[PDB]
Amino acid sequence: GRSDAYTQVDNFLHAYARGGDELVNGHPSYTVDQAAEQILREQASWQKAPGDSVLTLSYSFLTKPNDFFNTPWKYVSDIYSLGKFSAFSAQQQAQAKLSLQSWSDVTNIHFVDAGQGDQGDLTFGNFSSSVGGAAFAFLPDVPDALKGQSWYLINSSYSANVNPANGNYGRQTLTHEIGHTLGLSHPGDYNAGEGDPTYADATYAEDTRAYSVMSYWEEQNTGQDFKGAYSSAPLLDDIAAIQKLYGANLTTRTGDTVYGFNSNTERDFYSATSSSSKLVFSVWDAGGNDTLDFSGFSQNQKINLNEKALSDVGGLKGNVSIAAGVTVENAIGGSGSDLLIGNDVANVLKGGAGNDILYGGLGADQLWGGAGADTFVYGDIAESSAAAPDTLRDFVSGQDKIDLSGLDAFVNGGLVLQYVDAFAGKAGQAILSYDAASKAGSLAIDFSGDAHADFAINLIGQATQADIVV
Amino acid sequence: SSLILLSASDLAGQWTLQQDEAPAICHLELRDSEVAEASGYDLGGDTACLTRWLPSEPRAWRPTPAGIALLERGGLTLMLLGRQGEGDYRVQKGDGGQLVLRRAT
Ligand SMILES: [Ca+2]
Ligand SMILES: [Ca+2]
Ligand SMILES: [Ca+2]
Ligand SMILES: [Ca+2]
Ligand SMILES: [Ca+2]
Ligand SMILES: [Ca+2]
Ligand SMILES: [Ca+2]
Ligand SMILES: [Ca+2]
Ligand SMILES: [Zn+2]
């Protein structure tokens, strides 16, 4: 029967399911695309200037109140005074630039620094008299007197916007409000301080900040948990939404990119610097041989390389995801016992220390268990065909295991393996080979019974009959 | 627009968590002293009472943009109480009931 290892793989592959027909948390469940359409429901957007191949927007940091701040009531009925105006501090400006960059990284927009003043298409400023929330901004369908503006609350009672930093609320607020200025709405109809909106007022279940920084609701509402951290950059649904407006940025990170520890992204939110780093990010990558390096954590992790999939990394739940249309090739676990799930292409999976469970999936995968008792799982013979077999690069007989327990042939067909030296037209016959000289080995199986191997796994290190679980 | 993320000091004090209008109730003390391991703040009072509704006893908590989270030692959320209104946080029970957190007295 199916082993615990197989069940763990199967269970995580189906974790954080969305888009089904049944209700979730009393709400309809949306696919990434449906969520994107919903976020863009107001149909607001910037028009690319004539002669520009890509939308170009300048930004500036107000030095003094603009027309809107001086007489808000002339542009917004509800507001009479925004209190005391203050310019963005050096820290606020530096962080705003990182948030702007996180948006231009995923879609086709070129942001241009317009300095200090009111010359930018997008402007930033602080105010002290709350109008219901921590900040606000205007969609690009408003009159020029308000277009591109985002405002942030700062006073003796609220200091979250004073020191925005990687992973905190102040930084997400910048990313969120900037999102509005570019054309994104909250995933549902609600506004801070206006009435008493709750997650129950959401249009769809996935309206949480595990999927969109535009959401007002906690990631815990959908089962994720970032231990108090906040995504500093666009999430899964944000990426899909903004790309519907200005397209996918196919020039971004086309090199062999590493995310997590030892990152070469030069992006604070994609980088881990210690064993205590709380990572929260959605990967947008346009090409190359990429790796999710989570080697620096000790907690048991669950990593899923499929597009749109969420992973439990560094002790958090569903904090790492891969954007729709993105292909991440490799994954490196930490010192804990991890679950590494590959995708349809050839993946390099390294478990590291601990008793890991690796699942290459389709394609000829290079699997390293590392130290500890590791298990290499197969759920379909197509995952390691004789034509394109996986290679177990550090197999240790008596310690590691080749797990075929979930294969249909066994759990449903009741096939029994017969180890032989050569196929003779009998389904289930298997050949275990090993060359001491090259230290190379292999397992070949003829499931159909046509005397031809239809499943094979190459090995660097010997494997015996006892190392194979069925 | 963004929700105001209240500080621990903004919510600190004596609170009660009870099932609907039923007698089942627990007295809690939300403190604003930091707890590093849980990435939150100290939760005092009769926290042991909470095991009547939770798998383990939470001894830490933290404000969220639209609620209050009760935490296990490592920082994971054991219970998220959504803000229904000023000083009124609630969560739906597994069965069908509702737990309500309101300031004491
Ligand atoms: Ca890349
Ligand atoms: Ca790639
Ligand atoms: Ca694969
Ligand atoms: Ca490991
Ligand atoms: Ca091993
Ligand atoms: Ca290992
Ligand atoms: Ca494979
Ligand atoms: Ca065959
Ligand atoms: Zn907003």
From Swiss-Prot, chain A:
* Gene3D superfamilies linked to this entry: Collagenase (Catalytic Domain), Serralysin-like metalloprotease, C-terminal
Q: What is its main location?
A: secreted
Positions that bind Ca(2+) 7: 370, 372, 374, 400
Q: How is the cofactor bound?
A: Binds 8 Ca(2+) ions per subunit.
**Which parts of the sequence bind Ca(2+) 6?**
361, 363, 365, 383, 390
- UniProt-listed GO biological process terms: negative regulation of complement activation, classical pathway; negative regulation of complement activation, lectin pathway; positive regulation of sodium ion transport; proteolysis; symbiont-mediated evasion of recognition by host pattern recognition receptor
In which ranges do the Hemolysin-type calcium-binding repeats occur?
332-345, 346-358, 359-376
List ligand-binding residues for Ca(2+) 3: 334, 336, 338, 351, 353, 356
Name-wise, this protein is: Serralysin
* Natural source organism: Pseudomonas aeruginosa (strain ATCC 15692 / DSM 22644 / CIP 104116 / JCM 14847 / LMG 12228 / 1C / PRS 101 / PAO1)
Q: What is the lineage of its organism?
A: Bacteria, Pseudomonadati, Pseudomonadota, Gammaproteobacteria, Pseudomonadales
Curated annotation (Swiss-Prot), chain B:
Q: Under the cellular component aspect of Gene Ontology, which terms does the record hold?
A: periplasmic space
Disulfide bridge positions per record: 26-49
Where is it predominantly found?
periplasm
Q: Name one GO molecular function term.
A: metalloendopeptidase inhibitor activity
Part of the whole protein covered: 26 to 130 of 131
Domain of life assignment: Bacteria
- Family membership noted in the UniProt record: Belongs to the protease inhibitor I38 family.
Reply yes or no: does the keyword Ligase apply: no
Q: What is this protein called?
A: Proteinase inhibitor
Q: Which organism is it from?
A: Pseudomonas aeruginosa (strain ATCC 15692 / DSM 22644 / CIP 104116 / JCM 14847 / LMG 12228 / 1C / PRS 101 / PAO1)
Question: Which keywords annotate this record?
Answer: Disulfide bond, Metalloenzyme inhibitor, Metalloprotease inhibitor, Periplasm, Protease inhibitor, Signal
Q: What is the primary gene name for this protein? A: inh
Where is the protein found, in the record's own terms? Periplasm
* Protein role: Inhibitor of the alkaline protease. It forms a non-covalent bond with the protease and may prevent its autocatalytic cleavage in the periplasm.
